[PDB]
Each structure stands twice: as structure tokens, then as C-alpha cells.
PDB file of N, CA and C in Angstrom:
ATOM      1  N   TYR A 314       0.842  -1.185   0.000  1.00  0.00           N
ATOM      2  CA  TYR A 314       0.000   0.000   0.000  1.00  0.00           C
ATOM      3  C   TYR A 314       0.881   1.239   0.000  1.00  0.00           C
ATOM      4  N   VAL A 315       0.533   2.208  -0.842  1.00  0.00           N
ATOM      5  CA  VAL A 315       1.333   3.411  -1.022  1.00  0.00           C
ATOM      6  C   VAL A 315       0.424   4.632  -0.979  1.00  0.00           C
ATOM      7  N   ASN A 316       0.904   5.695  -0.341  1.00  0.00           N
ATOM      8  CA  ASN A 316       0.249   6.995  -0.358  1.00  0.00           C
ATOM      9  C   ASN A 316       1.177   7.990  -1.034  1.00  0.00           C
ATOM     10  N   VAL A 317       0.641   8.754  -1.980  1.00  0.00           N
ATOM     11  CA  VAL A 317       1.420   9.723  -2.737  1.00  0.00           C
ATOM     12  C   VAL A 317       0.696  11.059  -2.735  1.00  0.00           C
ATOM     13  N   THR A 318       1.449  12.128  -2.500  1.00  0.00           N
ATOM     14  CA  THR A 318       0.944  13.491  -2.566  1.00  0.00           C
ATOM     15  C   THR A 318       1.718  14.228  -3.646  1.00  0.00           C
ATOM     16  N   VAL A 319       1.006  14.966  -4.490  1.00  0.00           N
ATOM     17  CA  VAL A 319       1.627  15.582  -5.655  1.00  0.00           C
ATOM     18  C   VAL A 319       0.871  16.854  -6.007  1.00  0.00           C
ATOM     19  N   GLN A 320       1.612  17.851  -6.478  1.00  0.00           N
ATOM     20  CA  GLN A 320       1.041  19.067  -7.031  1.00  0.00           C
ATOM     21  C   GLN A 320       1.113  19.016  -8.550  1.00  0.00           C
ATOM     22  N   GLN A 321       0.076  19.553  -9.195  1.00  0.00           N
ATOM     23  CA  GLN A 321      -0.037  19.432 -10.645  1.00  0.00           C
ATOM     24  C   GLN A 321       1.110  20.138 -11.354  1.00  0.00           C
ATOM     25  N   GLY A 322       1.475  21.316 -10.893  1.00  0.00           N
ATOM     26  CA  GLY A 322       2.491  22.116 -11.569  1.00  0.00           C
ATOM     27  C   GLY A 322       1.865  23.011 -12.633  1.00  0.00           C
ATOM     28  N   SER A 323       2.259  22.804 -13.890  1.00  0.00           N
ATOM     29  CA  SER A 323       1.739  23.592 -15.000  1.00  0.00           C
ATOM     30  C   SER A 323       1.248  22.727 -16.157  1.00  0.00           C
ATOM     31  N   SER A 324       1.188  21.410 -15.979  1.00  0.00           N
ATOM     32  CA  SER A 324       0.680  20.505 -17.007  1.00  0.00           C
ATOM     33  C   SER A 324       0.055  19.312 -16.308  1.00  0.00           C
ATOM     34  N   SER A 325      -1.270  19.216 -16.361  1.00  0.00           N
ATOM     35  CA  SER A 325      -1.984  18.186 -15.623  1.00  0.00           C
ATOM     36  C   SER A 325      -1.708  16.807 -16.209  1.00  0.00           C
ATOM     37  N   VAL A 326      -1.734  15.794 -15.343  1.00  0.00           N
ATOM     38  CA  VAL A 326      -1.507  14.406 -15.724  1.00  0.00           C
ATOM     39  C   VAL A 326      -2.609  13.553 -15.116  1.00  0.00           C
ATOM     40  N   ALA A 327      -3.143  12.634 -15.907  1.00  0.00           N
ATOM     41  CA  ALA A 327      -4.180  11.741 -15.412  1.00  0.00           C
ATOM     42  C   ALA A 327      -3.602  10.818 -14.345  1.00  0.00           C
ATOM     43  N   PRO A 328      -4.278  10.650 -13.207  1.00  0.00           N
ATOM     44  CA  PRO A 328      -3.754   9.750 -12.168  1.00  0.00           C
ATOM     45  C   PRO A 328      -3.579   8.322 -12.644  1.00  0.00           C
ATOM     46  N   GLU A 329      -4.451   7.860 -13.539  1.00  0.00           N
ATOM     47  CA  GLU A 329      -4.342   6.498 -14.042  1.00  0.00           C
ATOM     48  C   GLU A 329      -3.052   6.287 -14.824  1.00  0.00           C
ATOM     49  N   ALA A 330      -2.561   7.319 -15.515  1.00  0.00           N
ATOM     50  CA  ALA A 330      -1.298   7.189 -16.236  1.00  0.00           C
ATOM     51  C   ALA A 330      -0.142   6.942 -15.274  1.00  0.00           C
ATOM     52  N   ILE A 331      -0.080   7.731 -14.200  1.00  0.00           N
ATOM     53  CA  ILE A 331       0.965   7.552 -13.198  1.00  0.00           C
ATOM     54  C   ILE A 331       0.838   6.186 -12.541  1.00  0.00           C
ATOM     55  N   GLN A 332      -0.395   5.782 -12.228  1.00  0.00           N
ATOM     56  CA  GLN A 332      -0.614   4.479 -11.610  1.00  0.00           C
ATOM     57  C   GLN A 332      -0.140   3.353 -12.519  1.00  0.00           C
ATOM     58  N   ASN A 333      -0.435   3.449 -13.817  1.00  0.00           N
ATOM     59  CA  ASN A 333       0.014   2.431 -14.760  1.00  0.00           C
ATOM     60  C   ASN A 333       1.531   2.398 -14.846  1.00  0.00           C
ATOM     61  N   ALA A 334       2.161   3.573 -14.894  1.00  0.00           N
ATOM     62  CA  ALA A 334       3.617   3.623 -14.935  1.00  0.00           C
ATOM     63  C   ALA A 334       4.214   2.934 -13.717  1.00  0.00           C
ATOM     64  N   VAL A 335       3.653   3.200 -12.539  1.00  0.00           N
ATOM     65  CA  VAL A 335       4.181   2.603 -11.315  1.00  0.00           C
ATOM     66  C   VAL A 335       3.974   1.092 -11.317  1.00  0.00           C
ATOM     67  N   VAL A 336       2.753   0.642 -11.619  1.00  0.00           N
ATOM     68  CA  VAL A 336       2.461  -0.785 -11.508  1.00  0.00           C
ATOM     69  C   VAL A 336       3.207  -1.572 -12.571  1.00  0.00           C
ATOM     70  N   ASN A 337       3.595  -0.927 -13.672  1.00  0.00           N
ATOM     71  CA  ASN A 337       4.431  -1.647 -14.620  1.00  0.00           C
ATOM     72  C   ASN A 337       5.900  -1.562 -14.233  1.00  0.00           C
ATOM     73  N   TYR A 338       6.301  -0.510 -13.518  1.00  0.00           N
ATOM     74  CA  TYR A 338       7.593  -0.557 -12.846  1.00  0.00           C
ATOM     75  C   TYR A 338       7.667  -1.730 -11.883  1.00  0.00           C
ATOM     76  N   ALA A 339       6.528  -2.129 -11.314  1.00  0.00           N
ATOM     77  CA  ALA A 339       6.517  -3.313 -10.464  1.00  0.00           C
ATOM     78  C   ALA A 339       7.028  -4.536 -11.210  1.00  0.00           C
ATOM     79  N   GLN A 340       6.690  -4.663 -12.495  1.00  0.00           N
ATOM     80  CA  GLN A 340       7.324  -5.665 -13.341  1.00  0.00           C
ATOM     81  C   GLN A 340       8.559  -5.122 -14.046  1.00  0.00           C
ATOM     82  N   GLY A 341       8.669  -3.801 -14.179  1.00  0.00           N
ATOM     83  CA  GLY A 341       9.898  -3.193 -14.647  1.00  0.00           C
ATOM     84  C   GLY A 341      10.151  -3.263 -16.138  1.00  0.00           C
ATOM     85  N   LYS A 342       9.347  -2.555 -16.941  1.00  0.00           N
ATOM     86  CA  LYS A 342       9.626  -2.505 -18.373  1.00  0.00           C
ATOM     87  C   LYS A 342      11.003  -1.917 -18.644  1.00  0.00           C
ATOM     88  N   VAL A 343      11.460  -1.010 -17.779  1.00  0.00           N
ATOM     89  CA  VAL A 343      12.649  -0.223 -18.068  1.00  0.00           C
ATOM     90  C   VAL A 343      13.903  -1.047 -17.816  1.00  0.00           C
ATOM     91  N   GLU A 344      14.953  -0.732 -18.566  1.00  0.00           N
ATOM     92  CA  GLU A 344      16.220  -1.428 -18.425  1.00  0.00           C
ATOM     93  C   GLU A 344      16.879  -1.082 -17.096  1.00  0.00           C
ATOM     94  N   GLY A 345      17.628  -2.042 -16.562  1.00  0.00           N
ATOM     95  CA  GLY A 345      18.417  -1.822 -15.374  1.00  0.00           C
ATOM     96  C   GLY A 345      17.677  -1.954 -14.063  1.00  0.00           C
ATOM     97  N   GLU A 346      16.379  -2.244 -14.088  1.00  0.00           N
ATOM     98  CA  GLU A 346      15.594  -2.427 -12.873  1.00  0.00           C
ATOM     99  C   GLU A 346      14.943  -3.800 -12.919  1.00  0.00           C
ATOM    100  N   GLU A 347      15.351  -4.678 -12.000  1.00  0.00           N
ATOM    101  CA  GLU A 347      14.834  -6.042 -11.997  1.00  0.00           C
ATOM    102  C   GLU A 347      13.357  -6.079 -11.626  1.00  0.00           C
ATOM    103  N   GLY A 348      12.948  -5.263 -10.669  1.00  0.00           N
ATOM    104  CA  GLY A 348      11.579  -5.232 -10.208  1.00  0.00           C
ATOM    105  C   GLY A 348      11.434  -5.766  -8.797  1.00  0.00           C
ATOM    106  N   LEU A 349      10.243  -6.291  -8.516  1.00  0.00           N
ATOM    107  CA  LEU A 349       9.930  -6.846  -7.201  1.00  0.00           C
ATOM    108  C   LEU A 349      10.087  -8.363  -7.266  1.00  0.00           C
ATOM    109  N   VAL A 350      11.343  -8.798  -7.226  1.00  0.00           N
ATOM    110  CA  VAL A 350      11.692 -10.212  -7.211  1.00  0.00           C
ATOM    111  C   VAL A 350      11.564 -10.739  -5.790  1.00  0.00           C
ATOM    112  N   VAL A 351      11.673 -12.059  -5.628  1.00  0.00           N
ATOM    113  CA  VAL A 351      11.664 -12.654  -4.298  1.00  0.00           C
ATOM    114  C   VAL A 351      12.704 -11.982  -3.416  1.00  0.00           C
ATOM    115  N   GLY A 352      12.325 -11.731  -2.167  1.00  0.00           N
ATOM    116  CA  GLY A 352      13.236 -11.119  -1.214  1.00  0.00           C
ATOM    117  C   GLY A 352      13.716  -9.742  -1.616  1.00  0.00           C
ATOM    118  N   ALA A 353      12.824  -8.913  -2.153  1.00  0.00           N
ATOM    119  CA  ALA A 353      13.164  -7.562  -2.583  1.00  0.00           C
ATOM    120  C   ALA A 353      12.293  -6.574  -1.822  1.00  0.00           C
ATOM    121  N   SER A 354      12.910  -5.802  -0.935  1.00  0.00           N
ATOM    122  CA  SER A 354      12.187  -4.755  -0.234  1.00  0.00           C
ATOM    123  C   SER A 354      11.863  -3.610  -1.186  1.00  0.00           C
ATOM    124  N   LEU A 355      10.915  -2.774  -0.776  1.00  0.00           N
ATOM    125  CA  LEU A 355      10.517  -1.620  -1.565  1.00  0.00           C
ATOM    126  C   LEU A 355      10.573  -0.374  -0.697  1.00  0.00           C
ATOM    127  N   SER A 356      10.986   0.736  -1.300  1.00  0.00           N
ATOM    128  CA  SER A 356      11.068   2.013  -0.614  1.00  0.00           C
ATOM    129  C   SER A 356      10.407   3.089  -1.458  1.00  0.00           C
ATOM    130  N   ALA A 357       9.830   4.078  -0.773  1.00  0.00           N
ATOM    131  CA  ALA A 357       9.210   5.194  -1.477  1.00  0.00           C
ATOM    132  C   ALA A 357      10.222   5.945  -2.325  1.00  0.00           C
ATOM    133  N   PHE A 358      11.492   5.938  -1.917  1.00  0.00           N
ATOM    134  CA  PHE A 358      12.522   6.597  -2.708  1.00  0.00           C
ATOM    135  C   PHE A 358      12.642   5.965  -4.087  1.00  0.00           C
ATOM    136  N   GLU A 359      12.627   4.633  -4.153  1.00  0.00           N
ATOM    137  CA  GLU A 359      12.756   3.963  -5.442  1.00  0.00           C
ATOM    138  C   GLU A 359      11.536   4.211  -6.320  1.00  0.00           C
ATOM    139  N   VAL A 360      10.346   4.255  -5.720  1.00  0.00           N
ATOM    140  CA  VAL A 360       9.140   4.554  -6.488  1.00  0.00           C
ATOM    141  C   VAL A 360       9.201   5.971  -7.044  1.00  0.00           C
ATOM    142  N   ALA A 361       9.634   6.924  -6.218  1.00  0.00           N
ATOM    143  CA  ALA A 361       9.783   8.294  -6.691  1.00  0.00           C
ATOM    144  C   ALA A 361      10.817   8.377  -7.803  1.00  0.00           C
ATOM    145  N   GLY A 362      11.901   7.612  -7.685  1.00  0.00           N
ATOM    146  CA  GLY A 362      12.892   7.583  -8.746  1.00  0.00           C
ATOM    147  C   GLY A 362      12.338   7.023 -10.041  1.00  0.00           C
ATOM    148  N   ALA A 363      11.529   5.966  -9.944  1.00  0.00           N
ATOM    149  CA  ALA A 363      10.891   5.417 -11.135  1.00  0.00           C
ATOM    150  C   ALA A 363       9.983   6.448 -11.787  1.00  0.00           C
ATOM    151  N   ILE A 364       9.205   7.167 -10.977  1.00  0.00           N
ATOM    152  CA  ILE A 364       8.346   8.218 -11.514  1.00  0.00           C
ATOM    153  C   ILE A 364       9.180   9.291 -12.200  1.00  0.00           C
ATOM    154  N   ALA A 365      10.276   9.704 -11.564  1.00  0.00           N
ATOM    155  CA  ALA A 365      11.095  10.780 -12.110  1.00  0.00           C
ATOM    156  C   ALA A 365      11.727  10.377 -13.435  1.00  0.00           C
TER     157      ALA A 365
ATOM    158  N   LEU B  51      -7.278  24.665 -38.119  1.00  0.00           N
ATOM    159  CA  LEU B  51      -8.668  24.940 -38.462  1.00  0.00           C
ATOM    160  C   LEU B  51      -9.466  23.671 -38.722  1.00  0.00           C
ATOM    161  N   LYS B  52      -8.798  22.544 -38.961  1.00  0.00           N
ATOM    162  CA  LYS B  52      -9.481  21.292 -39.256  1.00  0.00           C
ATOM    163  C   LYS B  52      -8.960  20.142 -38.396  1.00  0.00           C
ATOM    164  N   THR B  53      -8.049  20.416 -37.463  1.00  0.00           N
ATOM    165  CA  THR B  53      -7.453  19.357 -36.655  1.00  0.00           C
ATOM    166  C   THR B  53      -8.516  18.564 -35.913  1.00  0.00           C
ATOM    167  N   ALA B  54      -8.604  17.271 -36.226  1.00  0.00           N
ATOM    168  CA  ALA B  54      -9.485  16.360 -35.518  1.00  0.00           C
ATOM    169  C   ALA B  54      -8.745  15.346 -34.662  1.00  0.00           C
ATOM    170  N   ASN B  55      -7.440  15.193 -34.855  1.00  0.00           N
ATOM    171  CA  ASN B  55      -6.678  14.211 -34.098  1.00  0.00           C
ATOM    172  C   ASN B  55      -6.448  14.709 -32.680  1.00  0.00           C
ATOM    173  N   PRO B  56      -6.869  13.965 -31.658  1.00  0.00           N
ATOM    174  CA  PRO B  56      -6.479  14.322 -30.287  1.00  0.00           C
ATOM    175  C   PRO B  56      -4.977  14.322 -30.074  1.00  0.00           C
ATOM    176  N   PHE B  57      -4.233  13.474 -30.788  1.00  0.00           N
ATOM    177  CA  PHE B  57      -2.778  13.505 -30.688  1.00  0.00           C
ATOM    178  C   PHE B  57      -2.232  14.850 -31.150  1.00  0.00           C
ATOM    179  N   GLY B  58      -2.738  15.353 -32.276  1.00  0.00           N
ATOM    180  CA  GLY B  58      -2.321  16.667 -32.735  1.00  0.00           C
ATOM    181  C   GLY B  58      -2.706  17.765 -31.766  1.00  0.00           C
ATOM    182  N   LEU B  59      -3.887  17.647 -31.156  1.00  0.00           N
ATOM    183  CA  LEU B  59      -4.313  18.641 -30.180  1.00  0.00           C
ATOM    184  C   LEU B  59      -3.399  18.642 -28.962  1.00  0.00           C
ATOM    185  N   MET B  60      -3.032  17.457 -28.474  1.00  0.00           N
ATOM    186  CA  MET B  60      -2.109  17.372 -27.348  1.00  0.00           C
ATOM    187  C   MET B  60      -0.732  17.909 -27.716  1.00  0.00           C
ATOM    188  N   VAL B  61      -0.286  17.670 -28.951  1.00  0.00           N
ATOM    189  CA  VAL B  61       0.980  18.241 -29.400  1.00  0.00           C
ATOM    190  C   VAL B  61       0.897  19.761 -29.420  1.00  0.00           C
ATOM    191  N   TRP B  62      -0.220  20.302 -29.908  1.00  0.00           N
ATOM    192  CA  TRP B  62      -0.429  21.745 -29.858  1.00  0.00           C
ATOM    193  C   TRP B  62      -0.360  22.254 -28.427  1.00  0.00           C
ATOM    194  N   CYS B  63      -0.976  21.519 -27.499  1.00  0.00           N
ATOM    195  CA  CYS B  63      -0.933  21.903 -26.093  1.00  0.00           C
ATOM    196  C   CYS B  63       0.498  21.937 -25.581  1.00  0.00           C
ATOM    197  N   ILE B  64       1.299  20.939 -25.953  1.00  0.00           N
ATOM    198  CA  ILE B  64       2.703  20.922 -25.547  1.00  0.00           C
ATOM    199  C   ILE B  64       3.439  22.112 -26.150  1.00  0.00           C
ATOM    200  N   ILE B  65       3.070  22.494 -27.372  1.00  0.00           N
ATOM    201  CA  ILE B  65       3.666  23.673 -27.996  1.00  0.00           C
ATOM    202  C   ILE B  65       3.348  24.918 -27.182  1.00  0.00           C
ATOM    203  N   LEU B  66       2.088  25.063 -26.780  1.00  0.00           N
ATOM    204  CA  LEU B  66       1.629  26.264 -26.097  1.00  0.00           C
ATOM    205  C   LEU B  66       1.818  26.211 -24.588  1.00  0.00           C
ATOM    206  N   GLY B  67       2.033  25.028 -24.018  1.00  0.00           N
ATOM    207  CA  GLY B  67       2.303  24.896 -22.604  1.00  0.00           C
ATOM    208  C   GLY B  67       1.089  24.748 -21.713  1.00  0.00           C
ATOM    209  N   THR B  68      -0.118  24.850 -22.260  1.00  0.00           N
ATOM    210  CA  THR B  68      -1.317  24.711 -21.454  1.00  0.00           C
ATOM    211  C   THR B  68      -1.422  23.293 -20.894  1.00  0.00           C
ATOM    212  N   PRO B  69      -1.935  23.145 -19.677  1.00  0.00           N
ATOM    213  CA  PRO B  69      -2.249  21.800 -19.180  1.00  0.00           C
ATOM    214  C   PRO B  69      -3.382  21.182 -19.980  1.00  0.00           C
ATOM    215  N   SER B  70      -3.347  19.859 -20.091  1.00  0.00           N
ATOM    216  CA  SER B  70      -4.229  19.142 -20.998  1.00  0.00           C
ATOM    217  C   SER B  70      -5.302  18.314 -20.311  1.00  0.00           C
ATOM    218  N   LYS B  71      -5.057  17.821 -19.099  1.00  0.00           N
ATOM    219  CA  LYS B  71      -6.025  16.904 -18.496  1.00  0.00           C
ATOM    220  C   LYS B  71      -7.285  17.591 -18.002  1.00  0.00           C
ATOM    221  N   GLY B  72      -7.502  18.868 -18.287  1.00  0.00           N
ATOM    222  CA  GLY B  72      -8.763  19.504 -17.991  1.00  0.00           C
ATOM    223  C   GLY B  72      -9.775  19.441 -19.113  1.00  0.00           C
ATOM    224  N   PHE B  73      -9.487  18.707 -20.184  1.00  0.00           N
ATOM    225  CA  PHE B  73     -10.333  18.674 -21.368  1.00  0.00           C
ATOM    226  C   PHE B  73     -10.719  17.241 -21.702  1.00  0.00           C
ATOM    227  N   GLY B  74     -11.989  17.045 -22.048  1.00  0.00           N
ATOM    228  CA  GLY B  74     -12.401  15.789 -22.653  1.00  0.00           C
ATOM    229  C   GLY B  74     -11.736  15.620 -24.007  1.00  0.00           C
ATOM    230  N   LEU B  75     -11.166  14.440 -24.242  1.00  0.00           N
ATOM    231  CA  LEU B  75     -10.316  14.231 -25.411  1.00  0.00           C
ATOM    232  C   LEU B  75     -11.084  13.656 -26.600  1.00  0.00           C
ATOM    233  N   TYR B  76     -11.674  12.476 -26.432  1.00  0.00           N
ATOM    234  CA  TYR B  76     -12.174  11.707 -27.560  1.00  0.00           C
ATOM    235  C   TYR B  76     -13.407  10.907 -27.172  1.00  0.00           C
ATOM    236  N   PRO B  77     -14.308  10.665 -28.122  1.00  0.00           N
ATOM    237  CA  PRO B  77     -15.397   9.701 -27.919  1.00  0.00           C
ATOM    238  C   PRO B  77     -15.099   8.289 -28.403  1.00  0.00           C
ATOM    239  N   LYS B  78     -13.842   7.967 -28.694  1.00  0.00           N
ATOM    240  CA  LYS B  78     -13.497   6.722 -29.364  1.00  0.00           C
ATOM    241  C   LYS B  78     -13.574   5.534 -28.403  1.00  0.00           C
ATOM    242  N   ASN B  79     -13.376   4.340 -28.968  1.00  0.00           N
ATOM    243  CA  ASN B  79     -13.407   3.096 -28.206  1.00  0.00           C
ATOM    244  C   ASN B  79     -12.343   3.048 -27.119  1.00  0.00           C
ATOM    245  N   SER B  80     -11.268   3.830 -27.256  1.00  0.00           N
ATOM    246  CA  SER B  80     -10.199   3.801 -26.263  1.00  0.00           C
ATOM    247  C   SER B  80     -10.699   4.205 -24.884  1.00  0.00           C
ATOM    248  N   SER B  81     -11.811   4.936 -24.818  1.00  0.00           N
ATOM    249  CA  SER B  81     -12.407   5.271 -23.534  1.00  0.00           C
ATOM    250  C   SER B  81     -12.895   4.006 -22.842  1.00  0.00           C
ATOM    251  N   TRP B  82     -12.817   4.014 -21.514  1.00  0.00           N
ATOM    252  CA  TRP B  82     -13.124   2.823 -20.735  1.00  0.00           C
ATOM    253  C   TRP B  82     -14.566   2.389 -20.967  1.00  0.00           C
ATOM    254  N   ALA B  83     -14.767   1.073 -21.062  1.00  0.00           N
ATOM    255  CA  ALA B  83     -16.090   0.459 -21.187  1.00  0.00           C
ATOM    256  C   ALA B  83     -16.827   0.977 -22.427  1.00  0.00           C
ATOM    257  N   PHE B  84     -16.257   0.648 -23.584  1.00  0.00           N
ATOM    258  CA  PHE B  84     -16.893   0.929 -24.863  1.00  0.00           C
ATOM    259  C   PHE B  84     -16.781  -0.297 -25.760  1.00  0.00           C
ATOM    260  N   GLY B  85     -17.776  -0.472 -26.625  1.00  0.00           N
ATOM    261  CA  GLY B  85     -17.778  -1.595 -27.546  1.00  0.00           C
ATOM    262  C   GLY B  85     -18.891  -1.461 -28.561  1.00  0.00           C
ATOM    263  N   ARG B  86     -18.818  -2.316 -29.586  1.00  0.00           N
ATOM    264  CA  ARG B  86     -19.831  -2.304 -30.637  1.00  0.00           C
ATOM    265  C   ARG B  86     -21.197  -2.705 -30.095  1.00  0.00           C
ATOM    266  N   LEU B  87     -21.240  -3.715 -29.228  1.00  0.00           N
ATOM    267  CA  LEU B  87     -22.491  -4.119 -28.594  1.00  0.00           C
ATOM    268  C   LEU B  87     -22.660  -3.464 -27.225  1.00  0.00           C
ATOM    269  N   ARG B  88     -21.724  -3.729 -26.308  1.00  0.00           N
ATOM    270  CA  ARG B  88     -21.662  -3.158 -24.952  1.00  0.00           C
ATOM    271  C   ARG B  88     -23.000  -3.243 -24.217  1.00  0.00           C
ATOM    272  N   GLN B  89     -23.901  -4.112 -24.672  1.00  0.00           N
ATOM    273  CA  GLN B  89     -25.211  -4.243 -24.053  1.00  0.00           C
ATOM    274  C   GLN B  89     -25.191  -5.112 -22.804  1.00  0.00           C
ATOM    275  N   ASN B  90     -24.132  -5.885 -22.591  1.00  0.00           N
ATOM    276  CA  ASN B  90     -24.053  -6.732 -21.414  1.00  0.00           C
ATOM    277  C   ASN B  90     -23.560  -5.933 -20.212  1.00  0.00           C
ATOM    278  N   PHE B  91     -23.771  -6.504 -19.028  1.00  0.00           N
ATOM    279  CA  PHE B  91     -23.358  -5.935 -17.747  1.00  0.00           C
ATOM    280  C   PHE B  91     -23.980  -4.571 -17.476  1.00  0.00           C
ATOM    281  N   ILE B  92     -24.948  -4.149 -18.286  1.00  0.00           N
ATOM    282  CA  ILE B  92     -25.642  -2.886 -18.091  1.00  0.00           C
ATOM    283  C   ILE B  92     -27.116  -3.188 -17.865  1.00  0.00           C
ATOM    284  N   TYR B  93     -27.823  -2.201 -17.319  1.00  0.00           N
ATOM    285  CA  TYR B  93     -29.246  -2.361 -17.056  1.00  0.00           C
ATOM    286  C   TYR B  93     -30.013  -2.299 -18.371  1.00  0.00           C
ATOM    287  N   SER B  94     -30.263  -3.464 -18.972  1.00  0.00           N
ATOM    288  CA  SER B  94     -30.789  -3.564 -20.328  1.00  0.00           C
ATOM    289  C   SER B  94     -32.300  -3.761 -20.357  1.00  0.00           C
ATOM    290  N   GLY B  95     -33.023  -3.151 -19.422  1.00  0.00           N
ATOM    291  CA  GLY B  95     -34.456  -3.286 -19.344  1.00  0.00           C
ATOM    292  C   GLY B  95     -34.921  -4.494 -18.558  1.00  0.00           C
ATOM    293  N   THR B  96     -34.147  -5.581 -18.575  1.00  0.00           N
ATOM    294  CA  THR B  96     -34.458  -6.716 -17.717  1.00  0.00           C
ATOM    295  C   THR B  96     -34.313  -6.350 -16.247  1.00  0.00           C
ATOM    296  N   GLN B  97     -33.400  -5.432 -15.928  1.00  0.00           N
ATOM    297  CA  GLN B  97     -33.237  -4.935 -14.567  1.00  0.00           C
ATOM    298  C   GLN B  97     -33.867  -3.557 -14.383  1.00  0.00           C
ATOM    299  N   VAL B  98     -33.428  -2.574 -15.163  1.00  0.00           N
ATOM    300  CA  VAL B  98     -33.875  -1.189 -15.013  1.00  0.00           C
ATOM    301  C   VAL B  98     -33.952  -0.535 -16.388  1.00  0.00           C
ATOM    302  N   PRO B  99     -35.013   0.208 -16.694  1.00  0.00           N
ATOM    303  CA  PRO B  99     -35.050   0.981 -17.944  1.00  0.00           C
ATOM    304  C   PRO B  99     -34.246   2.264 -17.811  1.00  0.00           C
ATOM    305  N   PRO B 100     -33.202   2.429 -18.616  1.00  0.00           N
ATOM    306  CA  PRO B 100     -32.319   3.589 -18.468  1.00  0.00           C
ATOM    307  C   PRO B 100     -32.743   4.731 -19.374  1.00  0.00           C
TER     308      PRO B 100
END
């Protein structure tokens, strides 16, 4: 379970887009990130890095 | 003057810098819960007249 607080800035983004990006980071489409493998802790810092 | 593509409209928005998620984009099938029939799982008169 994750709680995220965010300000729009100057270009609005649909929440579902961010949610999809995060949940696919869970499987990790991007290179260099294995994902949530067995025995892998998760931190809000890594989620924020994936978003960034 | 004739742009109908939502992709082109979003590109225009990126050009001008305006935020985009305040606008309805498209009536196409890409919107959630759309289909050619889409008569199932809805109140089709057997449950409620809509």
C-alpha cells in the first residue's frame, strides 16, 4: 500500500497514467531495474525515482 | 482549423504549454467500457429501464 501526494504544476496528468507507470515498474519494463523479485524490499525513494 | 486528431491537439498543447487533463479528449473506443455491442453488464431493461 502506497500513499502519494503531488502538485499538478503547470501541465496536468491523469492519475491512471501515473498508476500504470508505477504498476508496470513493479514488473519493470525499463532497463536496469529487476523489479519486485523474491526477497526484494521496496522504498518510497525507489518509487519516486521510477516516476522521475 | 481542421485538426481532428487528439494527438495533434495534445501536441499543440505541448507547444503552447497549457495543461491538458482539464479537457475531454475523444469519444473513441479507447475510452473505458466501450464496444460495438456493450449491451451486457448494463441495465438492459431486464433490470432497469435507463
